Symmetry: D2
Subunit: 224 residues, 4 copies
Amino acid sequence: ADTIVAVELDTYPNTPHIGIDIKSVRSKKTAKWNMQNGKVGTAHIIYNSVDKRLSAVVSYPNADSATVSYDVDLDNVLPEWVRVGLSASTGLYKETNTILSWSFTSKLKSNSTHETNALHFMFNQFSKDQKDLILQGDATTGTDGNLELTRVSGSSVGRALFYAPVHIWESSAVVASFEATFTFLIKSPDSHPADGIAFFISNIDSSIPSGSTGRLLGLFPDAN
Amino acid sequence: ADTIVAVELDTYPSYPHIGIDIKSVRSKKTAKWNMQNGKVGTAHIIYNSVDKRLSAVVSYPNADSATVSYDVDLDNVLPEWVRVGLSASTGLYKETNTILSWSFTSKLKSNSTHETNALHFMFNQFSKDQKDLILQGDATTGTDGNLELTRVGSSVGRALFYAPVHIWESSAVVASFEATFTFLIKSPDSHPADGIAFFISNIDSSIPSGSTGRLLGLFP
Amino acid sequence: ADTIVAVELDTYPNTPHIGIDIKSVRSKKTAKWNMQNGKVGTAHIIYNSVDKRLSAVVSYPNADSATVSYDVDLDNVLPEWVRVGLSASTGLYKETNTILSWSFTSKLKSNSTHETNALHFMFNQFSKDQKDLILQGDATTGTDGNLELTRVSGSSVGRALFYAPVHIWESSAVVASFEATFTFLIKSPDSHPADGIAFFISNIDSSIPSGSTGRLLGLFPDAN
Amino acid sequence: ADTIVAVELDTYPSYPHIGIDIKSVRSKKTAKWNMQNGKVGTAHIIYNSVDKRLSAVVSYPNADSATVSYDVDLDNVLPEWVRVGLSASTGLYKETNTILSWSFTSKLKSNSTHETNALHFMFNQFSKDQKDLILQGDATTGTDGNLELTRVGSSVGRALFYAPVHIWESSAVVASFEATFTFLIKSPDSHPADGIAFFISNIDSSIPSGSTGRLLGLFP
């Protein structure tokens, strides 16, 4: 089974929030989220191995933000090498999970001196043939220069992983951190749409588990 | 007096330690620090308005590293605009506080799309006439391209970056900063008393009168 | 007299272009420029000491760009320490010289190893009290979060320099480079407005020379 | 064959030199290079679609630096997508081609406001299992955290970054890239024959059959 760490935003009932998931769809932590239909939102995710705290903030205009944090040592949860990505799922609604931009930075600072390793990428435009992205499910790129995670026109699942593996952590590092930001547009001609969007970190060869729809986000195989 | 927030490393007697000062020389938090004479040390200081946690890690090559954190919302401690610098102060022993490198990055990110403001600077080589640095006290630049914070007696010196840093703002969704500096503390003495720190303060900050020794040149 | 290196865009007759000025208002090089009124433009300026070539590209939507380059060793033209800024001037027209964003990066790579010095700043929003900027002339900040170089409501001159001095070059550097980008909006209810906008590099204590209006751009004292 | 653009340094006899190869081992431009044995060298490679000039500078600490440029619009030479790597090849002498550090930055900037795409990576320490690197030939990682391009005989090895780099695009206003790497070439021999290079090529590029010695492992 794939090892997943995710920060998701979803409006699926199953009894509007953002949550931090560690290997399970049963969020270790959540916070309400005033999902604004048709408005561009921004999410920032940060982590560093000194605080060992995974935090996220999602925001829309008019000071409408939401945050959530969780103390966890990712070095004990994730393998040393991972891939990172975005995932989305919809219900039986006419909705979009468009990503307008996505950036990520990962750094490893060694116990040595001036010995730092890093990876950084930023997409503000997505090409029809975006070769440094691995597309899964209904995810396509290029439409209006954006990354459409789910099929636009019921129930769709899509993911986009950055092509290269990320060395998210290492034993000989004094500090390890990463940051990710993405802007998304969830547009729906429907008032209360069932939707889910997430940023995730997984084992390198991760793929969409059989049956990972709705609240599973294309990340988890059932609500275990 | 000056509004100061510092991350300091001093061996002023009990045991060598690293601490976080929030408007006081009485560290709000400390951790043991096994200071090594003649060895290059590295310090990383991180902060972000989400966790509102200030943390620092000090390490030596092929040795254990000391870390220390502290929950503090700098938005309630510091003025919106500040300057950042490094300060040192020797007790009375023959010791040096050479800075080999120093980087800083500050970012303010507003709700609006792609509305990020950043300031970043990196020094790996210091020149005799370093105009973007405000040197105070016995602080000098140029010797081997290094930044000597103290006189190479009871010396005290600081170096602040010339430009004011918009460290926080009310319209920001996230404000963060990171700072890294490498230092080398030499001393032919056994138990040298020394202090070195990274600090953030009001713009017009200067060395308080008689702020030597344990006062790190930051506190009156 | 101040030592100025500038890349300017101006529509002043004096017989629409972009030009590279080295210590003189008599451009060492120019290129036509299809000034689009009411459209946001972007300018990119680059230089590196290996090519010793100063180049700029200005662009508006619909593939409407313009470029200009000039071979020059800035180390022989500028002092070792400088300040950098933006300047603007208008004629007897109702026009604006609004800067929406401005970024700059300067790097010095020493003959040593892993010994690099850098300075980078980016403004995507300008505060009412922007302390790390030195405002001169009619330049004000904060209006709609922008930097208005000339007074908005005849003939106005304004400049904005970044507060800290830049170590644009040094004898012991193997490579020195800088890059600057800014987006500007020149809006005018008038068809053919007289205007000028520029990015410039000057001696540290540079100020607006007496009489530097119109084509002088607030940078040069007369057309010498 | 593979579409290659390289900046190479080789001592394969006439005199040591650095050159720029554009689809051929017959350098489109060269400059003398006073190679130093046992000394760490640094190479910086820069390019931007405005000047359409590819330039490189190689230098040693406390020594002269060799530079070489060449007007070339890579948009007419390279496919839109490529991979970037380092390659080396020893002649027959006992010599090493250790890479100590390697950085790369590529940016595409469209007309639209703030529509920049960038890729940046930096290696200062190489691990035994470097998954984001495609090692070819005698190339290995881990030894002292360095990247050994050649076997430590007539050895040849390359290392490419795992992810494809969108090096250029028709909708870009400016496309630029920079690359810096530090190398150390040891050899107990007097006139060692060696070759080392930074290259950009088609995605599925691999070491051409018998591309040893002067072929730098890049040319058939």
